[PDB]
Design a protein around this nucleic acid. Structure first.
Lengths: 97, 50, 107, 153
RNA sequence: CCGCCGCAGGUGCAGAUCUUGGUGGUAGUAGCAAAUAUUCAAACGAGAACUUUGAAGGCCGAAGUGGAGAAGGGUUCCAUG
């Protein structure tokens, strides 16, 4: 009924967050009487409590965009916020020369 | 806090042992006045002094 | 007789017209449950977790205007409820809602 | 205990009672006046519909700021609410009385609830916290419900 | 516990924004409106808008509703009911 004990342990057994602890909703009776950590490791081997994969923050369109910025696209006068001396300053230009 | 002095830790130690109810057999006695422990103190209700 | 199964194309858009942005996908779920009681006269309406996903596909503010449903009445198991006949509401993934009559399907 | 009214004969009547019950008083007196002249089956058919907002309890005495409905017109009254918890906690008591009927061997469906009375129980003191650091009380209003069934044609 | 004859007084209440205790009308009234938002199925159970689990949709968005400590708290910690 109450798997609050056995999501907390499972989080610190998997060494992830309890965000990612997937408890098998059909095999509830087996998880409910875990009672310890070594017997939650037994449930990973049995394969009820299993780690969820990381949610996809794909920075694939990010790479796609920079290749345009390397080519000088999206870098026009109407895509400049900071001053020329803030974007790439005059002291560092002088340092390079 | 976590950082305690030995004297204060013995003070708290007494206050925990004094925060248990009456035994059920006490009011089966002949001279029966006590119903419940009136001196029971809770960590939100009363703040122990200090 | 009683274990009867139909298809239904539901206009959510004219059941949901005017309700606030944080009470549409919830409101949509209440007029798939209301709809399931009107056609198939059953108080117990149990609407599948694959259809709930279909209503919340565009989030809470945006619901698909037309949604297609295989509305299915059935018997019951034991642990006897005040009612016997319930109605399972299941999603039918449809590409075009153009010229869909309500089909009377077979079990 | 000793009830307020004594029945015409203790044979044909079966008692029930509930002391210091956690409902409101004003909601429960009003739904115990609507029940006061109904058959034992006629009452449970009524109260279950008040629990489901199909028939209503007309609030007649304790009706200060009680909004209106269409259903109260069956009582010849304008105001009326659907007290779910009040109607439920004197349906446990008909369940209790209809059991005592069967224990006394009275006919299950000949009984008309003749006497029913709601007395105020001692209030339960907890408090609320209001403006300018001033604590005003937040007392609950429980009630003693007790009723007598009696056999009729 | 009381009548009569004497004696004695902290001896008679409607008031004092009197004191203490209790209860009314107001009234089932005001109210339970700060910071975006919840829905579906199943489980345990006498009982589910809230509990637990899965699946959704969301918020905090690394100067955080995150992970830790100082001061203060003192058992609030954790399990079983």
């Amino acid at each position: 009924s109450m798997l609050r004990l056995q999501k907390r342990l499972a989080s610190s057994v998997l060494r992830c967050g309890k965000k990612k602890v997937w408890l098998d909703p059909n095999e509830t009776n087996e998880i409910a009487n875990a009672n310890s950590c070594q017997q939650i490791r037994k449930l990973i081997k049995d394969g009820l409590i299993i780690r969820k994969p990381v949610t996809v923050h794909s920075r694939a369109r990010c790479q796609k965009n920079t290749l345009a910025r390397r080519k000088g696209r999206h870098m026009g006068i109407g895509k400049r916020k900071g001053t020329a001396n803030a974007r790439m300053p005059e002291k560092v230009k002088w340092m390079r020369r | 806090s976590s950082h305690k002095t030995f004297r204060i830790k013995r003070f708290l130690a007494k206050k925990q042992k004094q925060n248990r109810p009456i035994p059920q057999w006490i009011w089966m006695k002949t001279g029966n006045k006590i119903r419940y422990n009136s001196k029971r103190r809770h960590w939100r209700r009363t703040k122990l002094g200090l | 007789n009683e274990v009867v199964t139909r298809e239904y194309t539901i206009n959510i858009h004219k059941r949901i017209h005017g309700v606030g942005f944080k009470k549409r996908a919830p409101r949509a779920l209440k007029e798939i449950r209301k709809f399931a009681m009107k056609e198939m006269g059953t108080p117990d309406v149990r609407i599948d977790t694959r259809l709930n996903k279909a209503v919340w596909a565009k989030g809470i503010r945006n619901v698909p205007y037309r949604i297609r449903v295989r509305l299915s009445r059935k018997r019951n198991e034991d642990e006897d409820s005040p009612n016997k006949l319930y109605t399972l509401v299941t999603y039918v993934p449809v590409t075009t809602f153009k010229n869909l009559q309500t089909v009377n399907v077979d079990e | 205990v000793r009830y307020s009214l004594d029945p015409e004969n203790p044979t044909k009547s079966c008692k029930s009672r509930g002391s210091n019950l956690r409902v409101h008083f004003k909601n429960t007196r009003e739904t115990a006046q609507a029940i006061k002249g109904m058959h034992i089956r006629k009452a449970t058919k009524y109260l279950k519909d008040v629990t489901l907002k199909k028939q209503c309890v007309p609030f007649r005495r304790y009706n200060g700021g009680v909004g209106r409905c269409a259903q109260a017109k069956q009582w010849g009254w304008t105001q009326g609410r659907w007290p779910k918890k009040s109607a439920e906690f004197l349906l446990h008591m008909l369940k209790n009385a209809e059991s005592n009927a069967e224990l006394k061997g009275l006919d299950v469906d000949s009984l008309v609830i003749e006497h029913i009375q709601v007395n105020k129980a001692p209030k339960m003191r907890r408090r609320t916290y209001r403006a300018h650091g001033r604590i005003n009380p937040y007392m609950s209003s429980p009630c003693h419900i007790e009723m007598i069934l009696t056999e009729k044609e």
